[PDB]
């Protein structure tokens, strides 16, 4: 009888934040992996002490050896640099191989950028079902779209439904049309004077650039509280079979007119992985932005294939 | 400084459930009031024991005296008769007239001991008893509401989630109007994380007749459970619904929730409590949302408010 | 890939309260079993609706057929009457058999009274390891001892350690000597004037009679919020391998001078069940009260053996 | 009505961690202050995003201005220099003199903008900087404390639990005195759900040398982590420790926690802040617990308070 095992491939800012979350939520034993010697082990000691304050029994361990990931139920990958593409492609290939050897039945959540591109390399090097490999981005872009909308309307973000599909990047595709307040079309709140069409346009673009906005303010580093919470919600939805509807980068085999690619779309995450891809009724205009956003992904996936 | 004070008027199965939720969530001190001597004191002692299992400091007290609700930040009222005996004459010469008179003494005790409290009614005919409680207490209309939509919507949402095999958390579903057979669920506003439910009809997750049956099963959900229970009524979802409202107030969460609130022109209703989607915050019912209802939906709604009007008229007669 | 399954044998007051807890805590899917037709099914509908308010995906089902318990990870038993002994012994025998057929790898928590007696009958009829069958009582008696102490000192019960060993009943054995405030001997707070020796004596006896006190106040029925929370903490400690130190009725094979009996003593509950029995340094006076408390249990276990 | 206001003075790794804990636990509105321009504003925006993942309404703001702490119900202070550079001369002519002067401006801003707030210090030499902050702010001594014991005890407890293979929740372990090498962990008061740890020595769960090593590893825990990290210090357990104290106040939990508090005769200490087991409640440090320390333990303690005295004397000189 075994506790769920959650391995974080990469013990940087996002990685360590995800470990704290896993410990605060007693999701499972946490393994922080990193190539930098000692550092993960030091974060793990800090986190282990934090459990005494949370009155939990969570085992958190740091390591520099991939062998410690054997039997992981969930793996979340932030390892990489933020000529970056061939480097990260090399690392993700190495991560994918180690996963296939040590924990091939794991559910795998990629975060390393360019997200959608690196997701497919991971799957290819890993060989696991396309159903149990995915990338976090849409949940993050959605949480920002949701937050910005929620702030202007002055309602809880819980009651704001918003989504971002396509690729993680400046050409991500926020969908103002599908935004709702507890299922009420956002258009209704324009008519009632809660928000104007211009402010929605601005929030849509602010959602597109939100990462850069944080990066500019932080001065040194990118966002990580929300990136981490996003990947952990995906991990929570898998481990507790919550069947949550979330935008994630997932393998498509015809939906939205894409084949053999990981792209950001709404899915149902459950105990078996990405159990259902949801096919939105995009308008022509929305399909086009989606097709332009994933252009870069198609080409880079094809370029990196050529270079192996 | 002081912890928030939550008083539960009526210590039946719902009241005890709400107290257990409040202790579990460490929302504040809890006061269990009831007319039955000693019983509230027994439930408080049981719950006090449980805070040890929950490693919480929550104070839970039982009492047969209104003086102990002094300074309640939130009052939640389950006292009175229930629909269970429904005897077609029960609604008319028992439930309605008796509960109205209890709502008055309850309102007077609130006005005397905790006039600054947010008041959440549950006793039925809810939309009516909320009016009575409000008038008897003289409290601001936005600080007195009724729980019904949250519960009706919790069922509407559950049935929807169950068929689609997604979490109820991404099913947005609302029930507006009056609590009871006149309630108006809104299939057209149901969404799966903002996606209209129509999209899942066409993509085969759901048929519209199933949606129509779910609308009806939502209307009859209480009676379905009662008939199954043999004794009593549902109390778990009624309790969590009222506490979610109470939590939205105590923590200023600005949650969108269908609640029985005072309309002052919205939806064409004037000076009357009825179920509408509202924002609950630290200052109570802070905003009524006026949905762009179709005429069909608005007719359904107006008919729902008319039956509410009749019963407040009949009660105002005596 | 499967969600934890928790079956409640008995859907009465305690049983239903335990189901709510399981749903509030997303511990697993809950199966409420009862011999009374429809009633459990009705409580389950009520609880299923409660999940929409808690924004969870917990599946809660009611049933009148034992076949629905197959594959349960945890079973908690309240079925019975509150000539009661031969009746409950018959029921517990039936429960135990059904468990052995349908879910023999389950962790089993008994609550039906006389607790310690009914625990052994269950194990005998069930055949499962003595390690994965136990009874809840000490956690409940301890939570009352802890609460009463905490009230007089005006500290959080979290910071009060107190224990009750022996049999569930009027001769339960509260241990004032081992009571601590965050590990500080309670004796120290006598010397400082926080509590007197007489008040401790009174709390010890009030702990002994606490069930009856509630029963007298409730007028109709016995306690159940705390009984339920107690059994669920034991269940939580097993399902999440929390390794919690708790007084429970557990099989002894020499510890405390008892063999082939379930008695209330401190144990470590983990993912493998009752992983460790803790052997307190009882004084002679404490050993004696322990021996007198379990006298009734020894005899009734022997009497019921004779009658099979 | 208003949500509780929590201001974090210093938005480093600890401060950001505390803000994430406060948002996760919906304890109140959060104000991240720092001297670094824009950085607090960046962390607040990241955290604001996260409330969407947590389905919470928590307001998190970043600021480089003290005026925005107006009305804080709790202030938690991490600003200043850290031990990381420790350069044997760092403690004496940098850490001590520089942090004292920041604690004064921090204290003055508190006195002007939120004098009714519960103040939790973290900056080191903690026991000393707590005195400075208190004197500079003029706040009641029981409304200004320092976090150290909780963290030191969280480590003491973890190491103990780990060896015994039980949950840290049933290991009661306390560290008293000053934070730093002079801290005094108390192996004699350690218990496993009230059972003296001596009982587990004899029954073979633990050896006393292991207990002695764990006492030492507890003293050196910070430096152990720093040496492993390469860059920086621990921040996860420091953060949860201060928030547990802040939670005990905001929710009047009456938790027993070793905290750096003002002694007025207890333990033989007069007019001085040091680490003692205390009760934290809605009114702050409500009661100091005077343990029946053995002479050996009391000598250890007095030596710990003397080093604290020296550094407050040296700082008071200038």
Which one of C93, C132, C144, C168 is the catalytic residue?
C168
Q: Which residue has the tokens 């180690």?
A: A98
Closest by Cβ to B49, choosing from C38, C143, C160: C143
Size of interface C-D (CB pairs under 8 A): 78
Among chain D residues, the shortest Cα distance to C184 is held by: D189
Region of residue A41 (left: phi > 0; alpha: psi -120 to 50; beta: else): alpha
Contact at CB, D282 and B253, closer than 8 angstroms: no
How far A96 CA sits from the closest chain B CA (Å)? 30
Choose among C39, C52, C226: nearest Cβ to B158: C52
Q: D256: which chain A residues are within 8 Å (Cβ-Cβ)?
A: none
Q: For an interface test with A, which of C27, C51, C240 has the most A Cβ atoms less than 10 Å from its Cβ?
A: C240
Q: Of C203, C294, C308, which is closest to residue C249 (Cα–Cα)?
A: C294
Residues of A involved in catalysis: 168
Please indicate whether, in this complex, the C-beta atoms of D254 and B26 are within 8 angstroms of each other. no
Q: Which residues of A touch C (CB under 8 A)?
A: 1-3, 26, 55-57, 158, 240-244, 271-272
d(CA D218, CA D206): 16
Give the integer Cα–Cα distance in Å for B204 and D28: 44
Cis peptide before A33 (omega within 30 of 0): no
Mutate to test the interface with A, among D40, D50, D84, D153 (most CBs of A within 10 A): D50
Q: Do D194 and C184 touch (CB under 8 A)?
A: no
Distance between C55 CA and the closest CA of chain A, angstroms: 10
State the CB neighbour count (10 A cutoff) for residue A129.
Answer: 16
Q: At what angle do helices B96-113 and B295-317 cross, to 10 degrees?
A: 80
Rounded Cα distance between A204 and A173, Å, is 8
Asked if B48 and C147 come within 8 Å (Cβ–Cβ), the reply is: yes
Contact residues on chain D for A12, CB-CB shorter than 8 A: none
Nearest chain D residue (CA) to C269: D166
Is D179 an annotated catalytic residue? yes
**Gap between the Cα atoms of D254 and B33, Å rounded:** 26
Enumerate the residues of chain C whose CB falls inside 8 A of the CB of residue A158: 55
User: Is C182–D195 a contact, with Cβ atoms under 8 angstroms apart?
Assistant: no
**What are A60's two structure tokens?**
């958190």
| Bridging pattern class, strands B184-185 and B175-176 | antiparallel
Of the partner residues D193, D256, D289, the one whose CB lies closest to the CB of residue C245: D193
Q: What is the dihedral of CA D179, D181, D186, D191, to 10 degrees?
A: 80
CA distance D184 to chain B (A): 27
Nearest by CB to A182, from B166, B256, B290: name it.
B256
Which residue, among A1, A57, A156, A235, would best test binding to C if mutated, counting the most C CBs under 10 Å from its CB?
A1
Chain A, chain C: beta-carbon pairs less than 8 Å apart:
32
**B193 and A158: CB-CB below 8 Å?**
no
Beta bridge partners of C7: C31, C75
Structure obtained using: X-ray
Considering only CB atoms, which chain A residues are within 8 Å of C244?
57
What is the distance between the alpha carbons of residues A89 and A80, in angstroms, rounded to a whole number? Answer: 9
Contact C53 B155 (CB under 8 A): no
How many helices and strands, by DSSP H and E, does chain B display?
A: 11, 14
SS3 (DSSP) at C91 = helix
Structural domains of chain C sorted by starting position, each given as residue range(s) with its CATH number in brackets: 1-137 (3.40.50.720), 138-308 (3.90.110.10)
Pairing of strands A60-63, A29-33: parallel
* Optimal mutation site among C15, C27, C46, C59, interface B, most CBs of chain B within 10 A: C46
CA distance C218 to chain B (A): 4
What DSSP element (H or E) covers B310?
A: helix B295-317
Identify any residues that bridge with A180 across adjacent strands, giving them in sequence order: A161, A185
Q: Which residues, 6 or more positions from B57, have their beta carbon under 8 angstroms from its beta carbon?
A: B26, B51, C156, C157, C158, D251, D252, D253, D254, D255
The CA distance from A293 to C40, in Å, is 52
Supply A71's token pair.
């039997």
Q: Is the Cβ–Cβ distance between D18 and A198 less than 8 Å?
A: no
Beta strand spans in A39-193 (E): 60-63, 74-77, 107-110, 133-135, 160-161, 164-165, 173-174, 180-181, 184-185
CA closest to C158 among chain B residues: B55
A-D CB pairs within 8 A amount to 156
DSSP letters spanning chain D: ----EEEEE--SHHHHHHHHHHHHTT--EEEEE-SSSSHHHHHHHHHHHHHHHTT----EEEES-GGGGTT-SEEEE--S--STT--TTHIIIIIHHHHHHHHHHHHHHHHHH-TTSEEEE-SSSHHHHHHHHHHHHT--GGGEEE-SHHHHHHHHHHHHHHHHTS-GGGEE--EEB-SSTT-EE-GGG-EETTEEHHHHHHTTS--HHHHHHHHHHHHTHHHHHHHHHSSS---HHHHHHHHHHHHHHHTT--EEEEEEEEEESGGG-EEEEEEEEEEEETTEEEEE------HHHHHHHHHHHHHHHHHHHHHHH-
D54/A229 Cβ within 8 A: yes
């Amino acid at each position: 009888n075994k506790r769920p095992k959650i391995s974080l491939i990469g013990s940087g800012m996002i990685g360590g934040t995800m470990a704290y979350l896993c410990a605060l939520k007693e999701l499972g034993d946490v393994v922080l992996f990193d190539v930098v010697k000692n550092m993960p082990q030091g974060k793990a000691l800090d986190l282990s002490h934090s459990t005494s304050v949370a009155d939990t029994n969570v085992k958190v361990t740091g390591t520099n050896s991939y062998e410690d990931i054997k039997g992981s139920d969930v793996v979340i990958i932030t390892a990489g640099l933020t000529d970056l593409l061939p480097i990260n492609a090399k690392i993700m290939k190495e991560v994918g191989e180690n996963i296939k050897k040590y924990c091939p039945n794991a559910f795998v959540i990629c975060i390393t950028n360019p997200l959608d591109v690196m997701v497919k390399v991971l799957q290819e090097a890993s060989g696991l079902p396309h159903n149990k490999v995915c990338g976090m981005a849409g949940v993050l872009d959605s949480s920002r779209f949701r937050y910005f909308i929620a702030e202007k309307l002055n309602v809880s973000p819980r009651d704001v439904q918003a989504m971002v599909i396509g690729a993680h990047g400046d050409n991500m595709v926020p969908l103002p049309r599908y935004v709702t307040v507890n299922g009420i079309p956002l258009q209704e709140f324009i008519k009632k004077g809660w928000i104007t069409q211009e402010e929605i346009d601005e929030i849509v673009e602010r959602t597109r650039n939100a990462g850069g906005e944080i990066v500019n303010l932080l001065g040194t580093g990118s966002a990580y509280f929300a990136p981490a919470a996003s990947a952990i919600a995906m991990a929570e939805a898998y481990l507790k079979d919550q069947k949550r509807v979330l935008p994630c980068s997932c393998y498509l085999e015809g939906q939205y007119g894409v084949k053999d690619l990981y792209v950001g779309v709404p899915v149902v995450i459950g105990g078996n992985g990405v159990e259902k891809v949801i096919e939105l009724e995009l308008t022509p205009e929305e399909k086009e932005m989606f097709d332009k956003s994933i252009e870069e992904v198609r080409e880079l996936v094809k370029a990196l294939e050529a270079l192996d």
